[PDB]
Amino acid sequence: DSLVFVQTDKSIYKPGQTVKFRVVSMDENFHPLNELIPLVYIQDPKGNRIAQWQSFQLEGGLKQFSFPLSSEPFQGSYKVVVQKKSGGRTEHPFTVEEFVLP
């Protein structure tokens, strides 16, 4: 039983930008944990797993990832999903949008 959570460097990204997120783990008293996470992935508005990293171990209590969005990506709400060994899961949404007219 540890506290894992996800954080993106932004809440809203525009086409062409690289999404950067961090997976963090800690215990009560906020002690950093070098936890081995079984799964973390990004899901787009259509429900696709456009990126996925397996069996990685946190260093210093966290691990950073990045995902370069294409120039014409689906727009709307995405989500980073992390699955911890204990079977617990955590979802962190983020959006990608810009709109046709400036």
> Which amino acid belongs to residue 43?
Q
Reading the block at residue 48, the tokens are: 């696709």
Which method was it determined by? X-ray
- Residue 61: its H or E element: none
Distance CA(20)–CA(75), nearest Å, equals 17
CATH number of the domain encompassing residue 6: 2.60.40.1930
**Domain of residue 43, residue span:** 1-102
Give me the resolution in angstroms, 1 decimal. 2.3
